[PDB]
């Protein structure tokens, strides 16, 4: 017998009978994880005679007892109370939390499947000793659960409840489609605003469950989970708050024009040709290719980047593909969402899940938009987008201001970021006086051409400086729109044809 | 909140959701059920939400209650102790009863699925206060998720391990078809328990008229008299006297009564001679559109037989037809194997019979085990199948189990066991389904004012006695046979028999 | 290298590659059959690759040549002679013969499947040095890819040509549970033929233990005794006594047996009332499941008529079930049309039958053809089918061809042919399937030590017997049938054989 505080949400296995490998038993795999982690273990019936499942339940409480972690049911009270069960897992569509709580009495875990904010509203409105921990909806598609309707982004509108709301009696796990390709991600990015909590624990079933090999795959998971590092780019991630020097500035630009970087393009066939011309201005070789084989081969190519736009021709399968495909090899990923209309708020949000950006890029509404909401708000919301999606975020107007949410790669559970709120990441402004997709071009370059030892913070405001320079230069030398366009791109070479930045008119204040 | 001894178990209704009629309600059901009867209400969710579940069966634990008859739960404990049920049903492969009475405590009703005589020796080895009734097996085949006989062998595992605690429920596929036989046949050997209840599902649930149907079961259910056949039940103690031997065949003279014969290829010709001897005509139909047609002439009466050729869907059809215009079956199970065990063990279940008659060995088989020992088995058919039992050999045992059709909800019989049923003798000193052919007749001919046991013997006799005179006019096994038939033809075309020399007495 | 004579044609395995249980090799197959007989194997592709086919040749070749056992090749020529294989078996859709014996010359083997009488001539008229031996036809049902008679007719006309150079191999079916009777009733009509040994497969190669199954293909093979009922089967040159027709008479009175008729509807009572006044009880079942728990029953004997209505999947149930058990079967084909032809030709490839029943007509065509005419025809059916036979007529005749269940290789009788079996005659002046109920009572009764001979002989007597004395107490067909039955009763109830009108005469 346990007590609320002792249970180690860290590595959260939850069973299910049909789906085992042939010539393996549900207790040779639970087993086999409790070796290696599987801190903590809910047992699953779906489908089972509600015997059979006191009879399999019973026999793993024995070798859970054993190795001292906590058994929970799911989602049958009765059979809980009747095999002196720890806790018992409940839904939202299965008894009422209060009901349970009279039967069972407190000190008997409950947990709580919740997928939207206003079911945390409710649990605050029941206060201590009624939930103790919530599942957190299912972040991605599974094919486990077979019957209502997330993502991080869902995920950390839950968590966001949960300190409006201060319940700090009740703890968190997410669940759901949770594999070694994007655990670390999710316990990346599945942070509360204000920075003070996080996941406690990650949940799997498919993982270990359906395993050929249990013992194994166990320790992956692992390995992952009590990690700190999410290096997601080849990059540095380090937090500098000294703003961009001129020497900083011109080693980005001898890199990218030394490295050759080669762009790959997925974007609308308005800036495929513009977009194309940026990228040979900058000294690299642009690739147009929506093809989802060759994603993987692309990707592989040395100094490869990833430019990526919405409204794009290409199905989101392929979308999927090619973003997983440049975090497989560590690769810069510039996101731009040129949205606005319904069809492209669903399709955006379901790219937004699909890894992890190096950098967003967007005007004052697709900013505004992105943080779910002047010039003050402008800066307070492209710091949220930076924190939320932990990325570099840039947000273009007359002023063009750059924040980064990488926070150096850090996650942890539970903690959660080390008090680093939204409000105090750095966020730096640029601008050079009254005068699109070029701008994800260049910054895609500057990225795309750093070392090891670059750093991607000064590289994505090297970009803005770069282009916004351009940009007055060729506000002056220009007839109108027409020759506006031709003379920015030849700006962009001459400038960078002679590294003296110590030129260039934009000015880098403090945001 | 009841207890356990106000739980009134007569009409006995378990609810299906996905079943009712389009523009009808679960609600609506159950209640015009409760206004006619149903006095006691189980909710059954296989499938739904175990919250809608509780919403649900808390809007129709206030309907019940106020009807003043209790809501039982099947089978979530949790959702039975959650919202204050008055008891739960569990089946064999649920949670263990030990574990549910230490979740609820006492005071609470607890239901066992029980099909199987072994399955009464756990709950008993359990003791009272455990396990306070049960539903018994499968009755008949249904298409929401043994028979009668398979039920009396638990009625009398409940006996022999004295649980005088638990109730009885009866279960599966019962509609006003078999009701009544139902109840009638199931009670203990020993006369001293029957089922509490009866149990019914898509019988009122998926009624296009509830509240009709449940007036119907009611109807039956606390009625006392199964007139299964349109002829007198009553229990003569008297020994058939030569006056009463005399009028029977008179009246079956009279009434030249139609014998459908269901038979082998063997007895075909052999039992339709037998029957012509009789002065009454068979017929050899074996053809199942034909059956209501037939069984609705006058005097009509179904003789039967195992091995036949036709199919069992067809002789469930006759037995049917012929129970509906309430008509006499005799039957007469040639075995033995595993095949024909099987078989008659089906057609047992299909209706009641007015006669089974069988042989030594074909009578032992059926009473589930000398002379003395012919004489117990040839009650215990008689009373086990509640039928006029015949026995044939050197001396024939006519026995009544017929109890003038009574039956009662857990009562049982009026206390009459297998024991002291009549039970009487016939001889002729020493000397098949030919008996089947003339019982046949004789019952046939039978008024509405006759008696059955009195006629059942009379074809004994008869039969009987036309043998001596056969035996004693005969060359060899052929002439025997013509002389059997010409002597029954001499013997009922002259009522004397008060000159027949077969004896008959008391057992 | 072999040489033609040193081709042992006992255990013949045929491989098949796509058949082998899962974990096993076509390897370990044919090696394990190796080891306890396969004593001459043929490779079998018929959709590999005619590369791996050669491949396969060759590593099979080896572990051959190694038990010092040939290998031959099916139907590839080319592969033949590429792995230098010691012989090749073509069919009739494939290489004329003669095209074949010019490209592989004399000195290698090579074997024909043929099927029928016709391909025999064509194989005579090439004369030795051509075909080597040859598969006869398909023999039963197979799933890889005429019975026995079939086979018959194609071991004559292998003698009617005199082709002494020619071997032959039964193929088609061929497992444990009718191997001996393919070995025992395959001779020739001239008894100096029969089959040189015996083809498998998917008996060996299908086996989950290819082993065992292997042993057990050699115990049938090498034995020389069909015991296929439990009785008495010696060659009896003595005549009958009275003695013997007496002794039988009292085994069946004493051991009531159980004859199990199936039958049309017009011999089913009648037939009945036969086996009754013998003392003994008669069966109708015509019941597919019930059949091998009929014949576990003692004394237990199976009447066979053709035109029953009954199935013939189940006759086929039934025959086997009686051979199972070793009990006696009677078998009485009423003809003479397309259709029955047909039926009946197929029952006679079910089983092993202890007595075949006609008359003039049924049992010319049996033999596939007067008083010497009658007399050579009950002889020839008698030794085709290896059984006693009876012509009725006037004249009855009774032909015991059983020779002791006594089989072997290619030998293959003791010089024991169609002209020289036991036969006898039974007459007793100028006057049906009651005779065929008559001998299965009789054959029934006896124990064993007795005598299928005897038994069947003692019947025809008891029943011609009763014909003389019914047709004198008669005044018409009617009168005489039941005096016919009343006869028997009378007879059988005293055994003075030494007084019956019959008189029994050799033929
Ligand atoms: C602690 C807890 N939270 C939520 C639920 C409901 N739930 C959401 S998705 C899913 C399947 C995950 O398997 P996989 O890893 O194969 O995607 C489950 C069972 C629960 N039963 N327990
Ligand atoms: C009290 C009780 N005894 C047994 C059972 C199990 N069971 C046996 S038959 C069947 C279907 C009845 O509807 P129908 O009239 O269509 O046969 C049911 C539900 C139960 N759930 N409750
Ligand atoms: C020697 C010889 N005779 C005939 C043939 C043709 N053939 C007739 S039956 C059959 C398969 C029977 O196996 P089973 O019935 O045991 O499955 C085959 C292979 C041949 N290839 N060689
Ligand atoms: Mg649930
Ligand atoms: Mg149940
Ligand atoms: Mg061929």
């Known amino acids: 017998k346990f007590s609320k505080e002792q249970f180690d949400y860290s590595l959260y296995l939850v069973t299910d009978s049909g789906m085992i490998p042939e010539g393996k038993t549900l207790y040779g795999q639970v087993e086999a994880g409790l070796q290696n982690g599987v801190t903590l273990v809910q047992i699953r019936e779906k489908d089972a005679d509600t015997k059979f499942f006191i009879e399999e339940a019973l026999q793993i409480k024995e070798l ?43 000190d008997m875990v409950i947990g709580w ?16 000793d009624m939930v103790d921990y919530i599942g957190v909806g299912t972040l991605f598609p599974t094919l486990t659960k077979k019957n209502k309707k997330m993502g991080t982004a ?31 991600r999710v316990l990346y990015q599945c942070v509360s605003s204000n920075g003070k909590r996080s996941l406690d624990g ?32 080849n990059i540095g991630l380090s937090t500098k708050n000294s703003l961009t020097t001129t020497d900083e500035i011109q080693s980005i630009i001898s890199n990218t024009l030394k490295a050759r970087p080669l762009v790959q393009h997925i974007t609308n066939k308005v800036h495929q040709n513009f977009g194309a011309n940026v990228t040979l201005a900058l000294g690299s070789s642009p690739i147009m290719s929506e093809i989802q084989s060759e994603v993987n081969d692309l990707a592989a190519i040395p100094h490869a980047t990833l430019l990526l736009n919405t409204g794009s021709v290409a199905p989101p399968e ?20 040129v949205g606005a209309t319904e069809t492209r708020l669903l399709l955006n949000n379901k790219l937004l899940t699909f890894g992890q950006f190096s950098c967003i890029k967007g005007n004052s509404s697709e900013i505004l938009g992105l943080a779910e909401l002047s010039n003050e708000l402008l800066i307070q ?5 930076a924190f939320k999606y932990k990325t570099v975020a840039v947000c273009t107007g007359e002023f063009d201001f750059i924040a980064d949410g990488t926070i150096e790669g850090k996650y942890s559970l539970s903690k959660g970021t080390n008090g680093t709120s ?8 640029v601008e050079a006086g009254p005068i699109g997709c070029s701008l994800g071009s260049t910054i895609a370059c500057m990225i795309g051409g750093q070392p090891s030892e670059g750093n991607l913070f000064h590289a994505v405001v090297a970009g803005v400086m770069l282009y916004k320079a351009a940009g007055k230069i060729a506000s002056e030398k220009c007839n109108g729109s027409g020759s506006f366009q031709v003379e920015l791109i030849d700006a962009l070479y001459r400038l960078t044809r002679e590294n003296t930045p110590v030129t260039w008119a934009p000015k880098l204040t403090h945001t």
């Open 318 to 337: 392929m979308l999927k593909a090619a973003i997983r495909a440049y975090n497989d090899v560590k690769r810069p990923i510039v996101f731009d969402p």
């Open 154 to 184: 869902g995920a950390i509108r839950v968590l966001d409840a949960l300190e409006r709301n201060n319940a700090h009696w009740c703890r968190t796990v997410g669940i759901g489609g949770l594999h070694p390709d994007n655990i670390e």
């Open 113 to 128: 499947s919740v997928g939207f904010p206003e079911e945390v509203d409710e649990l605050s409105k029941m206060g201590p």
């Open 202 to 233: 990650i949940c799997v079933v498919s993982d270990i469950i359906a395993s050929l090999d249990a013992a194994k795959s166990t320790k992956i998971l692992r390995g992952l989970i009590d990690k700190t590092d999410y290096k997601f780019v």
């Open 381 to 385: 919301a492209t710091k949220i987008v």
């Open 422 to 429: 939204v409000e105090d990441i750095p966020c730096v402004a």
């Open 64 to 106: 859970c007892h054993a190795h001292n972690v906590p058994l929970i049911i799911n989602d049958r009270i009765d059979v809980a109370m009747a095999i002196g069960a720890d806790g018992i897992h409940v839904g939202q569509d299965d008894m009422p939390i209060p009901m349970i709580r009279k039967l069972v009495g407190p």
